[PDB]
Amino acid sequence: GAMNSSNYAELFNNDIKLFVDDTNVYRVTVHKTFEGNVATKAINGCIFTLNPKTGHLFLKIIHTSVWAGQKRLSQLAKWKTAEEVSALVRSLPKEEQPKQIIVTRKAMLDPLEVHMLDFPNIAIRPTELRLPFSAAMSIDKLSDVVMKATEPQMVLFNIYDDWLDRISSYTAFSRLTLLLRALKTNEESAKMILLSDPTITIKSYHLWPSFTDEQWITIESQMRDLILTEYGRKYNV
Amino acid sequence: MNTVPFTSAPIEVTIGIDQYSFNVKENQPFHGIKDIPIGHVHVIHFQHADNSSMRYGYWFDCRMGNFYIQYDPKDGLYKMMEERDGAKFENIVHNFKERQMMVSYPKIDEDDTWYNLTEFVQMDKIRKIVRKDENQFSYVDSSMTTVQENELSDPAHSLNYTVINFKSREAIRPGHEMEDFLDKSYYLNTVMLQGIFKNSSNYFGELQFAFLNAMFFGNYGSSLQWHAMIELICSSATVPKHMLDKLDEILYYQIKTLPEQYSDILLNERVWNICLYSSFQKNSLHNTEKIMENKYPELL
């Protein structure tokens, strides 16, 4: 079945599962041609495949060459996502293959399902949650590796840095989604909040700053306030 | 012209023969249907005045033997049987006609409806879908489930229609995942036509037989099968021109023949709007589209 607020804690049990977010797979800029018509230019993209229990991120970089000479690219992008996810599963040892894959957008169900026909016991699921995974390219280190890539490439990250050394998966995921929610609603402020203090740095092998426990509390409160402000502005409440 | 006599009619029943039907009263002296046109399959079907549930009936072809109906008070329904004694059967049939206790198969001479609904249906294929090889006719009813329905219980009573499933290894070549799922041409032409059905006529025949079981018995898995087979064709970029033209004729008479009041459960909204308006063959069903619009514009 679909994933929603009721069955939310299932993400943190011991059944291996992956979220797949395809929002950044096919990325364009829109511009005017010399004759005044509109054309698109593709830039590099990424499939965002995340184990929400362990933090392991499977960042499959989608090089613009993938699109060359192809039509209906937004539809193709869904099939290339499904192809790349299927190949990821096949590449993993049996005991590491997921029991479920949750697609953040319902348009991926058919492509993934068709691509996973070899894995009948892997359940493909939609979600009613409104996960902010499209803000993944607001994370500087992820945006940088995608934009610099010169060929298809898989890059592996732990999106939780070392957080699990001190907090649970459940809490880890709520921090991640709150950070990314903030980044989505107002990137400029969100990024300001994370870096205002030069003395708190990002380890070379990490994505986020090395806040102490007490500093994460001030951060999470700052991100909360950001989200609610932007809401009043959006709707005039 | 052939005859199916009835030993008696002990219970109030609506009898159908093909697209015709008659009300028969309890212990009314009804003794059969005459002038049944040779050369086609037929179906004789029943709905008791007391149980508007369970429509049931018998597919048959009179070239394959002498058949008659007899009520069975133990099982509570009209049974088809075969009389092996040719002489003994002509005797019953002639005396009943002499006594004029038989209705005449009421074919208007202008009317090709039944031929059009059954063009490609052959008794031999029916008996493979309804396996009961000791009888030469086939029983079907409202509640019988299909083989595919059963996979998702009793196999003696299954409708062994050809399983179609768009999200299956059979349908999708490895490496052509996207291609084959958007363009089912491979699945239609190679897997189904050349592989399983062997030619388009056996495919049309199953399609039509499925439709008629849905119309006559409200058999819900039959409706599913009919829709699946239409969808497979309409979702294929590459179909022989002769199949498209015949398909438009097949579907026209099926839509023409459907009871106006049943269009809500027999017609799948998604399939028909996809076939007529989104699919590769949106432009190849001019008669089917014209009749659908003028008769069921709401469903669309």
Side-chain angles (χ1 to χ4, degrees), chain B residues 85-146:
Chain B
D85 182 342
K88 177 184 188 184
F89 179 90
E90 299 158 25
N91 166 257
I92 292 312
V93 160
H94 172 281
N95 168 85
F96 280 155
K97 284 191 190 175
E98 272 288 59
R99 305 251 272 168
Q100 293 201 56
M101 305 268 109
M102 300 195 174
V103 300
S104 169
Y105 185 95
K107 196 187 168 302
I108 308 311
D109 323 283
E110 171 202 39
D111 181 53
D112 271 336
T113 301
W114 187 248
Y115 176 80
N116 292 335
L117 286 176
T118 58
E119 178 162 5
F120 298 97
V121 183
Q122 310 269 356
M123 257 320 307
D124 73 281
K125 300 308 206 309
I126 290 185
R127 302 183 66 245
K128 300 177 201 303
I129 301 171
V130 196
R131 310 178 168 283
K132 192 176 208 235
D133 295 330
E134 64 273 10
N135 297 337
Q136 289 274 292
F137 48 89
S138 298
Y139 174 94
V140 178
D141 66 20
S142 280
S143 66
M144 276 171 59
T145 50
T146 68

Side-chain angles (χ1 to χ4, degrees), chain A residues 62-76:
Chain A
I62 301 301
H63 188 261
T64 48
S65 71
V66 168
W67 312 127
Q70 322 283 340
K71 275 130 172 53
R72 289 197 59 77
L73 298 184
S74 83
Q75 157 199 281
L76 168 62

Side-chain angles (χ1 to χ4, degrees), chain B residues 8 10-11 56 69-79 81:
Chain B
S8 66
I11 65 169
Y56 60 103
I69 296 291
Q70 190 172 97
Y71 183 67
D72 175 358
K74 183 154 159 140
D75 286 13
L77 80 187
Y78 292 93
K79 294 194 161 154
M81 293 171 289

